[PDB]
Amino acid sequence: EKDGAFERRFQKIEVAEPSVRQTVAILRGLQPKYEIHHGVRILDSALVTAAQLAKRYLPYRRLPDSALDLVDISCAGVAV
Amino acid sequence: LENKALDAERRYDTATAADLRYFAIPDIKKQIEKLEDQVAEEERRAGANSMIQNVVDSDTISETAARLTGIPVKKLSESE
Amino acid sequence: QFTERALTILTLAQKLASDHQHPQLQPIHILAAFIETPEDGSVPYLQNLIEKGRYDYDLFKKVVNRNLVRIPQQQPAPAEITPSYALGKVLQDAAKIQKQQKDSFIAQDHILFALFNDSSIQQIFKEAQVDIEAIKQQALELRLSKYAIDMTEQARQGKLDPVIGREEEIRSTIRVLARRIKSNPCLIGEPGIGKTAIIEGVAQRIIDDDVPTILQGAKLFSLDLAALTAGAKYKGDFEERFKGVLKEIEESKTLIVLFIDEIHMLMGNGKDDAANILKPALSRGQLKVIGATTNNEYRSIVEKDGAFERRFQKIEVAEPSVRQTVAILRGLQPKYEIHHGVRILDSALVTAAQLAKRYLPYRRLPDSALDLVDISCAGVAVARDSQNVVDSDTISETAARLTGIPVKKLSESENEKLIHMERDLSSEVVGQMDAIKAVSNAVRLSRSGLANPRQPASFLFLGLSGSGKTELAKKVAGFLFNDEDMMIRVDCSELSEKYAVSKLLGTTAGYVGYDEGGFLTNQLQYKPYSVLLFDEVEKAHPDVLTVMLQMLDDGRITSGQGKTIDCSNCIVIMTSNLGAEFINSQQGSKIQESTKNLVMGAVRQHFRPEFLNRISSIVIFNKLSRKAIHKIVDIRLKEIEERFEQNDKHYKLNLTQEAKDFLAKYGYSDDMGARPLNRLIQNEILNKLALRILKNEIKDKETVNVVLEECLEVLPNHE
Numbered sequence: 041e042k043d044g045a046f047e048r049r050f051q052k053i054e055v056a057e058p059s060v061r062q063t064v065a066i067l068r069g070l071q072p073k074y075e076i077h078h079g080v081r082i083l084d085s086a087l088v089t090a091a092q093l094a095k096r097y098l099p100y101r102r103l104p105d106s107a108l109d110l111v112d113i114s115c116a117g118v119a120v
Numbered sequence: 121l122e123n124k125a126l127d128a129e130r131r132y133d134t135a136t137a138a139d140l141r142y143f144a145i146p147d148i149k150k151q152i153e154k155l156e157d158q159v160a161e162e163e164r165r166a167g168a169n170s171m172i173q174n175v176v177d178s179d180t181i182s183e184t185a186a187r188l189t190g191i192p193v194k195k196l197s198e199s200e
Numbered sequence: 201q202f203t204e205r206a207l208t209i210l211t212l213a214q215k216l217a218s219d220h221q222h223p224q225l226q227p228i229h230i231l232a233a234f235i236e237t238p239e240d241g242s243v244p245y246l247q248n249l250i251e252k253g254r255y256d257y258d259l260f261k262k263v264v265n266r267n268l269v270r271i272p273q274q275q276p277a278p279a280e281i282t283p284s285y286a287l288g289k290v291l292q293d294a295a296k297i298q299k300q301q302k303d304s305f306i307a308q309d310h311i312l313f314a315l316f317n318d319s320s321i322q323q324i325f326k327e328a329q330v331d332i333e334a335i336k337q338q339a340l341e342l343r344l345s346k347y348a349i350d351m352t353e354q355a356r357q358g359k360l361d362p363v364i365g366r367e368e369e370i371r372s373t374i375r376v377l378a379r380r381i382k383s384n385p386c387l388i389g390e391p392g393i394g395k396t397a398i399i400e401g402v403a404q405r406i407i408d409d410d411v412p413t414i415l416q417g418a419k420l421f422s423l424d425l426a427a428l429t430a431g432a433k434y435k436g437d438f439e440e441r442f443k444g445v446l447k448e449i450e451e452s453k454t455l456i457v458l459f460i461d462e463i464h465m466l467m468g469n470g471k472d473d474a475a476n477i478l479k480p481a482l483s484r485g486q487l488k489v490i491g492a493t494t495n496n497e498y499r500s501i502v503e504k505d506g507a508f509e510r511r512f513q514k515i516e517v518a519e520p521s522v523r524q525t526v527a528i529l530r531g532l533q534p535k536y537e538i539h540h541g542v543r544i545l546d547s548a549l550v551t552a553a554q555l556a557k558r559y560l561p562y563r564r565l566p567d568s569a570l571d572l573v574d575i576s577c578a579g580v581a582v583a584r585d586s587q588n589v590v591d592s593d594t595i596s597e598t599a600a601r602l603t604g605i606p607v608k609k610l611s612e613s614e615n616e617k618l619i620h621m622e623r624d625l626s627s628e629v630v631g632q633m634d635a636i637k638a639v640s641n642a643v644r645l646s647r648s649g650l651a652n653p654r655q656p657a658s659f660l661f662l663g664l665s666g667s668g669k670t671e672l673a674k675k676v677a678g679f680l681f682n683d684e685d686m687m688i689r690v691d692c693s694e695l696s697e698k699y700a701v702s703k704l705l706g707t708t709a710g711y712v713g714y715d716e717g718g719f720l721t722n723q724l725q726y727k728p729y730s731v732l733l734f735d736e737v738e739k740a741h742p743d744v745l746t747v748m749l750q751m752l753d754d755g756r757i758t759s760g761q762g763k764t765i766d767c768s769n770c771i772v773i774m775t776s777n778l779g780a781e782f783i784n785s786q787q788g789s790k791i792q793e794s795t796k797n798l799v800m801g802a803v804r805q806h807f808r809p810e811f812l813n814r815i816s817s818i819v820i821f822n823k824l825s826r827k828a829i830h831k832i833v834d835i836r837l838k839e840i841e842e843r844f845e846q847n848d849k850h851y852k853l854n855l856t857q858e859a860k861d862f863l864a865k866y867g868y869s870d871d872m873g874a875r876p877l878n879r880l881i882q883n884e885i886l887n888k889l890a891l892r893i894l895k896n897e898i899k900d901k902e903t904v905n906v907v908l909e910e911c912l913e914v915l916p917n918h919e
């Protein structure tokens with residue numbers, strides 16, 4: 041509204057929150073980065089769980105990140 | 121190794137990518153598998169390696185989500 | 201290749217040889233050009249590289265005049281035979297100098313240099329060293345390209361996109377420039393209209409000789425910003441660069457026209473005469489300047505200034521019509537075909553312009569059209585790996601790729617994609633297909649390009665609680681948007697007299713909040729197409745039901761910040777239980793004649809006719825009778841199992857006829873609808889399940905059954 045220039049100089053791309061299934065795929069893609077950083081192992085069901093829990097319990101933080109918070113935090117819990 | 125192989129592919133040095141895509145990368149994969157077998161349960165204990173908590177979907181993550189949001193449902197406690 | 205100054209000096213060398221009746225051109229003749237005039241301002245003669253460098257200009261003057269006298273008088277026919285290798289070399293060396301100096305054009309100084317570098321006095325009567333460094337020093341200290349781009353030269357070199365229609369504002373521009381006092385036209389209007397395009401159009405008129413001489417010879421430049429500020433470090437150096445340029449354009453070189461695209465770049469900072477003012481200050485000395493600004497920027501600066509207003513002519517620039525827009529697309533068509541190496545159909549240019557209007561309320565026709573064309577061409581350029589731009593499919597697809605607008609998908613599997621909505625939605629929504637048809641009809645009209653562009657489809661769903669009014673809206677959001685929750689259900693019943701910004705009404709600037717209609721207006725703005733539903737419209741305060749008239753007809757949506765969305769490509773669902781008093785008469789599961797009039801009667805007595813008149817159709821949904829809920833119970837149980845996270849165990853769902861019947865008879869009433877069914881399944885089936893789960897005894901699979909009421913099994917695998 042305040043601009044009216046940049047507004048016209050780029051393509052608006054809406055970025056939707058990924059589905060829970062996509063989120064799990066993300067979590068799986070990142071699984072080794074968590075395991076390597078933390079020096080821990082995780083379950084595949086853990087990845088599934090984080091995506092689902094985030095969908096259910098963190099409605100102010102979108103999935104990818106919310107689920108990853110659960111993963112990272114969980115891994116940190118274990119690392120400690 | 122995958123990053124190196126991938127770099128070789130983007131460098132158009134595919135032959136050196138092959139040096140890793142074949143043999144080395146799957147060897148490390150197999151080393152990982154062998155290590156998991158070493159970690160795996162023994163007749164004397166539920167997992168050879170006790171410290172690995174294997175970030176458990178419930179015991180670690182549904183628990184973590186509860187540590188962050190309370191959401192007592194995900195405690196899944198025997199106290200029911 | 202050469203500046204006008206360099207061409208003048210060389211030309212004079214040639215013509216002086218003609219005037220002096222001299223054969224082959226010599227270094228002497230270029231030196232003659234140097235001393236061609238008494239004007240001190242001529243660097244080649246008095247304010248020289250020689251005179252302010254190392255030697256008396258007279259020394260050189262006499263070298264040349266002695267030599268000019270010395271060369272014998274020829275027949276006029278050979279008087280200037282050829283530059284030969286001698287002047288060829290000087291001009292070539294001037295080019296070598298450009299390369300060394302990184303100069304885009306040959307300067308008269310490069311000619312002075314190159315000639316001097318090659319030359320030597322040919323006779324004992326005068327002597328002087330070619331003091332190369334002195335002549336360079338003096339050249340470097342003398343004489344806009346440092347601060348601006350020569351738009352005219354770029355145009356001479358092509359690098360320009362032709363215009364259509366805007367010729368009239370160009371003619372106005374020329375007419376203003378031709379003025380003796382207020383010589384500065386300014387292009388004012390919406391972004392994307394073509395104001396830059398106009399200034400290029402001006403460059404074309406200069407290039408094409410369509411301009412009266414007093415403007416015809418003008419050199420048009422792209423000014424400031426970088427030169428203005430990037431070139432700045434300290435107080436006053438803006439004014440220095442300004443003054444420098446202004447002086448340059450004030451004299452000698454016929455005329456130079458400066459162009460300022462974004463005038464907002466000036467106006468100082470709260471004025472304070474923070475440099476900007478120098479231009480207005482000197483503006484009386486003709487200083488032909490063309491400027492431009494967004495109408496709202498104009499506003500934000502005209503309101504503050506008043507000074508520049510007496511220097512410039514305000515010119516509104518009109519937006520071209522769709523057909524005119526097509527003409528620009530046609531004019532630029534070859535630019536686009538060249539840009540990407542693709543062909544484009546004329547019909548594509550046409551559909552792009554028309555469709556673009558329909559598509560983009562936030563783009564002017566020339567942007568929206570050029571966007572579809574350049575985007576499509578770019579899309580095709582990717583497809584170059586396989587193509588060309590298609591009027592129908594390419595335009596439809598790139599528009600849809602970017603805005604979704606599924607109406608343009610025109611899928612090859614139309615059987616599912618709309619034709620069988622009656623079957624697909626009946627499966628999801630059990631009940632009269634007519635409710636379903638009302639929606640599918642609207643949808644089909646939107647896909648076929650038939651839906652009236654001035655009326656977002658809208659329906660009023662009359663029913664009982666538990667009827668599935670919302671359910672239908674969600675299921676069509678499911679079918680159509682691939683997301684049942686994409687839709688915005690609206691709390692219109694929760695609406696008193698304050699009902700502004702939390703609702704579509706938005707909020708007024710100057711009052712707290714510059715964020716408005718979040719739930720509705722902003723999301724409606726954000727989503728290129730959508731589903732909007734109003735919950736219990738009969739309970740809403742009538743003032744908003746009145747506001748709704750704005751988009752119930754037209755589809756037009758305007759916010760408290762005055763912004764417009766116009767979602768005529770969306771579907772709207774209004775719901776009410778207002779007619780429930782007559783629906784509850786039970787006169788047919790689907791309400792029959794006369795009774796339906798009483799159902800609608802309540803609607804007609806309650807709502808202003810105006811509300812009602814703008815609804816595509818008012819629909820009464822049949823009570824979902826017990827024989828029908830039979831299906832939803834089985835369906836619902838399927839959905840229930842599917843909603844339970846990961847499918848690790850889950851039911852075999854052996855309701856047996858007894859639980860099918862218990863659910864049908866206990867969880868349903870003609871006066872409560874289907875709602876109690878969900879409550880019942882959960883109250884008994886899921887609660888008992890929860891007990892088996894609670895105990896953490898279930899090992900694998902779950903079973904539904906009865907005790908002769910509803911009752912679950914326990915597995916032989918647990919306690």
Ligand SMILES: Nc1ncnc2c1ncn2[C@@H]1O[C@H](COP(=O)(O)OP(=O)(O)OP(=O)(O)O)[C@@H](O)[C@H]1O
Nearest residue numbers: 361362363364366391392393394395396397528566
């Ligand atoms: N006659 C025309 N009308 C509109 N656009 C044109 C025309 N001819 C060429 N164009 C192209 O369309 C675009 C018009 O953009 P222009 O810069 O004039 O918009 P604007 O009015 O300057 O607003 P802005 O400041 O967002 O550029 C240019 O990119 C130009 O190449």
Ligand SMILES: Nc1ncnc2c1ncn2[C@@H]1O[C@H](COP(=O)(O)OP(=O)(O)OP(=O)(O)O)[C@@H](O)[C@H]1O
Nearest residue numbers: 628629630631665666667668669670671832874875
């Ligand atoms: N036609 C149907 N097909 C399948 N399920 C249905 C149908 N109608 C109702 N249901 C069930 O009942 C509920 C649908 O009710 P809905 O959300 O439309 O409430 P409603 O009819 O708008 O009443 P309200 O006005 O009190 O919100 C859902 O939970 C759904 O399981």
